[PDB]
């Protein structure tokens, strides 16, 4: 427990861990909550903005890559706008060098190496961020990355301050696959935020960004005049 194996990206600990990368995987827990549900043919994303001050407008959490690929960062912002631009340029170039859409599984492999090639060197540090790539190509899939190069084609995710409270809500909810119910799927995803929202506080009055993407749906950002009629007024 001499803690000498803690300030470099090259030194390995005697237990086998790499503590400089493990600190970045812990940096995604200090971000706002987010959750994405995968239906049979639709994919939603419930991003919670971080309204810092009273006068300041809330920060943006949900972004866009193409018409069908949309991400939602959860971590520091300085390493999110760089990974978004070094994803969009790897997306529009595929629609320019070729003409079909970019294969979502072949896109994430080019983003995982943006983490991996940024870790092995010593002058460069690991990306402290956690992406949630939500896309639909032929089948709706919800991919996600990590500071360490690792992929898991999920079905229901969570990243955030109270991510464990929303994780438990999806652990006991496996009835999202069979019945799609687009009008009710966003109710489940919005419930995932409300069940883990700042120790019994409301903060859902047009402060939680939503996005839906599916079969004939492009990356439609849910308008501010549509998520508060009944989507935010269920219980």
């Amino acid at each position: 427990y001499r803690n000498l194996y803690d300030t470099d990206n090259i030194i390995y600990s005697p237990e086998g861990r790499l503590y400089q990368v493990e600190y970045a995987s812990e940096a995604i827990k200090q971000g706002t909550c987010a959750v994405a549900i995968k239906s049979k043919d639709y994919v939603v994303v419930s991003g919670l903005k971080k309204c810092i001050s009273k006068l300041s407008f809330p920060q943006e959490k949900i972004f866009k890559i193409d018409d069908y690929i949309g991400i939602s960062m959860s971590g520091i912002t300085s390493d999110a706008k760089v990974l978004t631009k070094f994803m969009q340029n790897e997306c529009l170039s595929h629609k320019f060098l070729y003409n079909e859409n970019i294969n979502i599984e072949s896109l994430v492999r080019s983003v995982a190496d943006k983490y991996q090639k940024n870790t092995q060197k010593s002058s460069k540090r690991a990306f402290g961020v956690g992406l949630m790539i939500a896309a639909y190509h032929n089948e709706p899939c919800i991919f996600e990355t990590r500071p360490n190069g690792s992929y898991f084609e999920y079905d229901a995710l969570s990243f955030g301050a109270r991510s464990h409270a929303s994780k438990t809500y999806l652990e006991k909810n496996l009835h999202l696959f069979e019945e799609c119910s687009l009008e009710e799927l966003i109710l489940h995803c919005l419930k995932a935020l409300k069940c883990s929202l700042s120790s019994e506080s409301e903060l859902t009055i047009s402060n939680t960004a939503l996005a839906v993407v599916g079969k004939n749906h492009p990356w439609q950002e849910i308008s501010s005049l549509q998520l508060e009629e009944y989507l935010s007024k269920v219980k």
Binding site: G16, Q120, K167
Partner: protein, 233 residues
Amino acid sequence: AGYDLSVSTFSPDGRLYQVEYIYKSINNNNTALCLECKDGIICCCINSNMDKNKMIKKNSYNRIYHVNNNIIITYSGFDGDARNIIDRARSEANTYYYNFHTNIPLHILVNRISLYIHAYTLYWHMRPFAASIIISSFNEKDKGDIYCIEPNGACYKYSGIVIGKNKEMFKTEIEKKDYKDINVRDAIEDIYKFILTSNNLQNLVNFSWICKESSYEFQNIHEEILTPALNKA
């Protein structure tokens, strides 16, 4: 105490750390398995990380990569630092195909991948790799050959090898048969019996054999060959 920080520094007895600590990392992540059979080569992967996630798909975390038609490669350890070697493993097969118009033989691919893994254990600016790669194939006139390239080179040719959190337990169970006996079909039952002994009824494993006289090429199991799994013996 002071001689184990960088990788370009030796120890007074003669050993070398920071390439030694990696062995405690590949022996703690999800294990692997690959062993010779009289009909072909059959790999495996035991992703023992259920409890933490439980939300991923059924067969979404696959770890049986291949460079081309008949050479299977698995991992052990860091999933990021192991995919980077696969790109060097795939690009080595393509460079050999451009310059020589032939499939790359295994006794020259495992050497060109060894001088890539080992080359990172020399520069002080870069960190060494964190993966144990299993490389194998099955020729038509010759039997299989599994190369377990560990970190710090050492491309040793094994015949049955496991690398992970139970690298010493399956070796006491693989020796229960020579395996240069009964075919790759019935060997699956013997493999699945080993996993339950050393951990419940979950479909997290994902193996892939190379030969069942199926043009001697790489393929997954099937969804119908996993079903007759003897859950008792």
